[PDB]
């Protein structure tokens, strides 16, 4: 009724230019602020560079077209699902239990859509208190044999199928300007959306918003979670 | 049809005089013994000190009874995650690529059954080349809030999945035994097992087997076998023991045949 879903982009979590590269410090720090929030979220994380380095490598988006992608898939596989380990480790050690839940594990995917078939499972485990992390992935795919799955369609499937009340998007950024602020210094911020960026209009309400907010800004999500307004950019309407 | 279920038991994958402690190098020599076969495999690994110590101090295997068990359950389900991708890093290294599936995070029990509703994530896995890892863990359940998966019930559930040609479990015996080795100098090897040797181990007529430890080892054994499937018990432990069972050649081990 009054869930937070939060997404960790991998940004913020990574160091998006040296592969492997987890930012423990800062994730420890969101991981306080959603604590000291007091609210009820459930979170969801990018990949990053446990994804995004070795994908662009072997050109996992574009599917299965030789067998060489077979390992580096594999590969990437393996560097989310130990992400998702480092970022469940700085949840726990904050009192909120969490368990990593990887959409190429369980789930699959179609004309670049995740398809959930069972929901069942990860519904149990929020009903248990033991809150389902899911997170981008490359995850089977039904005609391209694989597919990469994105943390903001998680967010997408997960906003669908729980029904929260706010949607948070935390980046490296302090939200959606006219063009990339570390190209272009001149751009400049873009407060409210209502008419890259796609997304936070399909989550949203008559009630329910969506935000974009810098998660290298301290104690700006607390503020955010405790409903204080802040830096950001906000969407609205439907 | 030539795949080989193996489960690499948490006896020997981990430590377990020590809480959280990996074997990297029984796990880096079994992968490599693995990959030295040339056969088609496919792994199940156990929990051990990754998911036992933490289970046994919060009786995690009596179901959900206070929220105190909550954040237990969590660390378990993290440390078996934790514990997976370093069994999948060592298969990785060996040029066998694997990926984690974590039952408590794809599948729910429900009596004491593991139930696998959805299978298509599983079989695309294996038909990409993939090796789909399932491991012991802590798994929702629809009565008693959450339950313990074993590797072995892991391992029944992908053996009516695949139908493979053999059946290898990897421990720190060299194989079944009368008794507890470790406490009973008198325990004497068990090299065959049958359902005519099946049915004599319900009877004790001393007392000194109340739990059926005996006849619960030998059917997790005889229910991987059938008219053609043999199963396998295999020391670990012992270099090249299992590479050498792999490639058909006959070493010390404990033999189930014939089915239930
Ligand atoms: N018009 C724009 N406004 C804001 N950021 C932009 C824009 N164009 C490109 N970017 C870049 O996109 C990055 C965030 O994208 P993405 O990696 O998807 O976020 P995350 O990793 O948090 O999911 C920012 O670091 C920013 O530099
Ligand atoms: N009849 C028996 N035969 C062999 N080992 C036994 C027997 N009874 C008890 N044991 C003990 O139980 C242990 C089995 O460990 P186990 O929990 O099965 O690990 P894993 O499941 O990871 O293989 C052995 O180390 C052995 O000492
Ligand atoms: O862009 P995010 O951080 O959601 O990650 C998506 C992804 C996952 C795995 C490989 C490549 C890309
Ligand atoms: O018996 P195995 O080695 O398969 O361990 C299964 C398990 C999982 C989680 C907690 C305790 C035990």
């Given at each position: 009724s009054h869930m937070i879903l939060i997404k960790l982009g991998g940004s913020v979590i990574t160091?998006?230019?040296?592969?492997?590269?987890?930012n423990k410090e800062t994730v420890s720090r969101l991981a306080d602020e959603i604590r000291r929030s007091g609210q009820d979220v459930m979170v969801v994380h990018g990949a990053g560079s446990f994804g995004h380095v070795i994908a662009k490598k072997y050109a996992?988006?574009?599917?299965?077209?030789?067998?060489?992608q077979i390992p580096a898939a594999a590969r990437i596989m393996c560097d989310t699902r130990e992400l998702s380990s480092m970022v469940v480790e700085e949840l726990l050690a904050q009192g909120i239990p969490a368990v990593s839940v990887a959409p190429g594990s369980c789930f699959v995917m179609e004309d670049g859509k995740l398809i959930v078939?069972?929901?069942e499972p990860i519904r149990r485990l929020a009903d248990l208190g033991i809150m389902p992390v899911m997170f981008g992935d490359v995850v089977p795919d039904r005609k391209k044999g694989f597919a990469i799955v994105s943390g903001d369609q998680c967010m997408e499937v997960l906003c669908r199928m729980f029904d929260p009340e706010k949607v948070v998007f935390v980046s490296d950024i302090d939200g959606l300007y006219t063009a990339d602020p570390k190209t272009d210094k001149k751009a400049r911020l873009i407060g409210e959306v209502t008419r890259k960026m796609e997304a936070m209009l399909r989550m949203t309400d008559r009630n329910r918003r969506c935000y974009l907010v810098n998660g290298?800004?301290?104690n700006r999500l607390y503020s955010l979670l405790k409903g204080e307004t802040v830096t950001c950019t906000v969407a609205k309407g439907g």
């Open positions: 160091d998006k230019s040296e592969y492997h590269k987890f996992i988006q574009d599917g299965h077209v030789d067998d060489g078939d069972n929901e290298n800004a301290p």
